[PDB]
C-alpha cells in the first residue's frame, strides 16, 4: 500500500520505514526535521532496499498536508510525529499541545478533506496514569497522566476516538507503547539524541562512551526485587514490526483498534545497566539518587491482545537491545552526519 | 482595564460586555459571527453607555490575536469565543476541537508573544463528570466528561493549567457554570438560537410562542422530587456579574482561580415550565418522553467558594429567568435583525 509516514525519518520512524519498504510498500516521509537529519534518508533506503519519497514540512500545516494526501494517493497513515521529551514537556506545556494535539488535529482534518481513512497512530502507555494494576491491560480505562506530554497523547485518543465515532468507516490503531530501545542489526541506524539523552538505555551509552561521568538512579527503595524501577523496554526492531502488522492488517477495518505493543514484562534499572556493562565490555559507572519527581516504582505492558488479535509479539530480547545499541554507539559515535 | 472578549457578541459575552461597559472598563470585542449577528452591536453600546470596539475575527488566527492585543494594549481577556452545541459536538467532533481546543491554544499563544498575562476561561461544570457527588465542588477532581463538547472544555482548563504552572505570574480563572437563562431587564437583549434551541428555557420559549408545538420531556422516572431532571439554572444577568468580578478581583494575582458560578441549588424540568407557564400568562405544552442519551437524574454547582473569595452570588431568581426570557422574546420575536 500507499503509505504517509509523518516523522518517518526519526528514531521509531526510520525503523519502521525500512520495515515498510522491505514489505514492499510505498513510502512517503513527511518530516519537518526538528528532531532529525536528511543524513538518515540515505540509509533508510539502503536497509530498506527500495526509494522512500521525502517531503520536508509540518504536520501543523493541513494544506500541505491534504496535498501530499492527494499527490500521492495514500492509503494510509503511521503517525510519529511530535514532540516527546517529558522534561520539556512540563517547562514547554504549549508547544506540546500545539505539536501533539494541534499537530495531529490538522493532520486528520486534511485526511478528511483527502478521503483517507486508515490511520495508525504512535500512542504511549503514559495514558494509563496512576494505574496500581500492572500490568495495564487495554480494557483498563485510563487514567490521567501526570505530564503535558502524557495528557497530550490521550488528548488524541480522544480525539480520534470521537472522530471514529462520527466517521464510521474510518480504521484506526492506537499503539500503546513504553521504553522503546535498541537500533538496526547493521548499526548503521539507531537512536540519536541532541543533547542530554532523556531515555535510560542512550543516558547509558553515553556513560559508557566516556560522554557522562555515572548514571544517576533516582530511588534504590521501591517496593521491587532489587529496589529500583521496573519498567518494559521493547526493541525498536520489534516495535517498527508490529507497526508495518498493525497496518497491514487493520487497514479497511473499521473502528478504533487499540493494542498494546510491549514484551509483556519489567526490567529494572540494574537489570538494565547490568545488560549495557555486558554489552559493551566495561562497567556502567552509576550512583543512586532520590526518587525522581513523578516516576512510580513498576509498570509494564500487557501484550496479550496484540499476540491474539495480530499475531505478533517481540523476538528480541534485552540483551539484543543493549548489543544493538552499543553497535551503533560504537560504529557511529557522532550518530548522524550533518 | 483594557479587555479583550472574544464571543463577546454573543449570548453571555454581549450581556457581559454591557456590564463591562457599565463598569467603566475599555472593551475589545473579538468575533467571528458565526454565531451572532452585527446587530447586537449597538444594543450593547446602548445598554453599556460606552463604546466598545468590534473587530470581526477568528480566534485561530494567531496573527490577528497577537495584533489585536498590541494594537490596544490588552490587560486581560476574558474567553467566551468557541461552539457549544453537545449534540453537534458529537456529530462534529473534529470542529469542536478545533474551535475550542486549537482556538485556546492560538488565544493564549498570541497572549503569550504579546505579554498579556490575565485570562478569564468561559468553563463549563461538564468537566465533573459522572459526579455521583452533588452538589460539585472545586476541590473534587474532575471526571470523564460525556461528550467531544464537555472533553474540549476540560482540555482546555488542563492546558491553561500547566501553561500557568509554566509562567507563574499569568493569572487565570477556569468559571465553570451549568445552565445560563435569561435576559438582560431591558428585553433589548437575550439568547438568539438559529434553529432548534439546545436548551429548555428558549426551547420552551418557543413552544410557548407558537414556533414548537410540545416541549419533549425526556425521562419522568428519574430518583427525583417529580421523576423529572433537575439541574442548575443561572441567570445571564448573574452570571456576566461573576464574570466582571473575577476579572476586576483577578487581574494580576498570580494562579489558577477555578469557581463554580452557579445558583447553588437545583430545579426540575417541570419547575421550570411551570416558572415558565407563569411568566408568559398560558399552559406550556409538553409530553413525557424516555430518558435521553448521557443525562443524569440530577445534578447542580456548590457556589460557596466565589461567595467567600469573589463575594459573588446570585440575586436573580428561577421566576425572573423566565420573565426576563419572555420578555425578550415578546419584544423582539426575530431575534437580532440580519
Ligand atoms: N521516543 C520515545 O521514547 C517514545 C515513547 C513513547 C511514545 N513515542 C511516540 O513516538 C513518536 C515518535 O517517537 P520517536 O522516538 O521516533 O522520536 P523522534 O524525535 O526521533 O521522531 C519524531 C520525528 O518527528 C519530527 N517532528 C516533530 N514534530 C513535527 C511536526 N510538527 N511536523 C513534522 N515532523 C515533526 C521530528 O523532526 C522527528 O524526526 C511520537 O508520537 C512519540 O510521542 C515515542
Ligand atoms: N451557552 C451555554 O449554554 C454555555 C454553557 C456552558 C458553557 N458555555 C461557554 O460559554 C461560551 C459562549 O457561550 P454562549 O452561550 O455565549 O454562546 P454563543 O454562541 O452565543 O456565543 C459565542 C460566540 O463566539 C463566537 N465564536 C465561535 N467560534 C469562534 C471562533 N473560532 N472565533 C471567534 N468567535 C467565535 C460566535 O460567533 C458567538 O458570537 C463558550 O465558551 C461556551 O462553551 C456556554
Ligand atoms: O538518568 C536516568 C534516566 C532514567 N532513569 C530510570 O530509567 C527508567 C526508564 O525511564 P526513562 O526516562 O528512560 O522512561 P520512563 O520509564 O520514565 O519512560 C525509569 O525508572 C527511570 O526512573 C534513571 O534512573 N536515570
Ligand atoms: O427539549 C428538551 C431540552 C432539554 N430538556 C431537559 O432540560 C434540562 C436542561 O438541559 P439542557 O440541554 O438545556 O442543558 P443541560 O442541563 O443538559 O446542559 C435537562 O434535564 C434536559 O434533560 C428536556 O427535557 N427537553
Ligand atoms: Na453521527
Ligand atoms: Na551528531
Ligand atoms: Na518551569
Ligand atoms: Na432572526
Known sequence: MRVLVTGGSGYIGSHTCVQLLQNGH??????????????????????????????????????????????????????????????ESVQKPLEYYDNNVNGTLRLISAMRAANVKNFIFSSSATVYGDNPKIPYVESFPTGTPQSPYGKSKLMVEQILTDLQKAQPDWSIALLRYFNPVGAHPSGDM??????????????????????????????????????????????????????????????????????????????????????????????????????????????????????????????????????DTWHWQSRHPQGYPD
Not at 533508510?44 to 527500495?50: C, P, V
Not at 540494574?270 to 539518587?289: E, I, Q, R, T, W
Open 26 to 87: 510505498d513510502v512517503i516521509i513527511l518530516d519537518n526535521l526538528c528532531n532529525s537529519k536528511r543524513s538518515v534518508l540515505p540509509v533508510i533506503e539502503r536497509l530498506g532496499g527500495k526509494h522512500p519519497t521525502f517531503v520536508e514540512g509540518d504536520i501543523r500545516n493541513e494544506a500541505l498536508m491534504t496535498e501530499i494526501l492527494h499527490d500521492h494517493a495514500i492509503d494510509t497513515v503511521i503517525h510519529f510525529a511530535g514532540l516527546k521529551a517529558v522534561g
Open 190 to 323: 539507531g537512536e540519536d539524541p541532541q543533547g542530554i539523552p532523556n531515555n535510560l538505555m542512550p543516558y547509558i551509552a553515553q556513560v559508557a562512551v566516556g560522554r557522562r561521568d555515572s548514571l544517576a538512579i533516582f530511588g534504590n527503595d521501591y517496593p521491587t526485587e532489587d529496589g529500583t524501577g521496573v519498567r518494559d523496554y521493547i526493541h525498536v526492531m520489534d516495535l517498527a514490526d508490529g507497526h508495518v502488522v498493525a497496518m497491514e492488517k487493520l487497514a479497511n477495518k473499521p473502528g478504533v483498534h487499540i493494542y498494546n505493543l510491549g514484551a509483556g514484562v519489567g526490567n529494572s534499572v540494574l537489570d538494565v545497566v547490568n545488560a549495557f556493562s555486558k554489552a559493551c565490555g566495561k562497567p556502567v559507572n552509576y550512583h543512586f539518587a532520590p526518587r525522581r519527581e513523578g516516576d512510580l516504582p513498576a509498570y509494564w505492558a500487557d501484550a496479550s491482545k496484540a499476540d491474539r488479535e495480530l499475531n505478533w509479539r517481540v523476538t528480541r530480547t534485552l540483551d539484543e537491545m543493549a548489543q
